[PDB]
Symmetry: C2
Subunit: 146 residues, 2 copies
Amino acid sequence: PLPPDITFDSLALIKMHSQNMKRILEVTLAKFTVNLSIVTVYRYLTARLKKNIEAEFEILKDIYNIVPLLDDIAIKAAQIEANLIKKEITLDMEDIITATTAIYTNSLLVTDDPKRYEPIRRFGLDTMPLDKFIKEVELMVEKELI
Amino acid sequence: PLPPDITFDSLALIKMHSQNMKRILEVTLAKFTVNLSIVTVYRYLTARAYLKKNIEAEFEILKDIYNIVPLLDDIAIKAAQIEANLIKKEITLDMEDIITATTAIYTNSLLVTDDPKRYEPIRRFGLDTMPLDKFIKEVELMVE
């Protein structure tokens, strides 16, 4: 079964807000606590040129638990990335902070590209492909109603 | 001269903590308020962690001498506002640069960097920068 706390990276969050995902997003918000790193929120607001920024942020802050780049997160992220650099791995800032925040909040990281975060698994990170997450949420709903 | 509030980006910070900059550092810490973005601190500590330093202890020191600025909601908002305005005109900078510059604007801090040119597109939003070499020269005068 899916845990209570989950999170998404920017790309997955963008998909969760697509028009054909409206019902699944509604169910997800009703059943889980979504803990988004402020960096994910930032990337969501930029990659997404269409609407209004400050207004969009208020909406996100109202439906999601936005997690700051807390001191403890900055420290752990530096430790994790330093360990990866030695192993010759290329993760950008957004990915490192997103994964570290997920570990800190004990949230399952839902993403379309779990493989990219694989090197962080040994540090306590748990991931799940977005497609599988969606199917599990669908199954949850079906069980509730049938 | 130099304003009351200043900040450094990652490379400038490294240099400010280097051995032959010890004198300049503490004259800076005594005369100005340095507002460092937590993003800059993260980059700095990543290098220190690679060198197997006790970054928890070093962070405590940074906290005691610098005003560490969180990636505040308002900073995230202003940064997104800036990046999308820049993207409108084929201009793109990495996240660290946008947040660092936005934080300097937010705290009314002069951004001291060894590469002022890459921040040029953000000056239109109110950012003021000063090359590191020039900052060092001015502090040296104060050192007397």
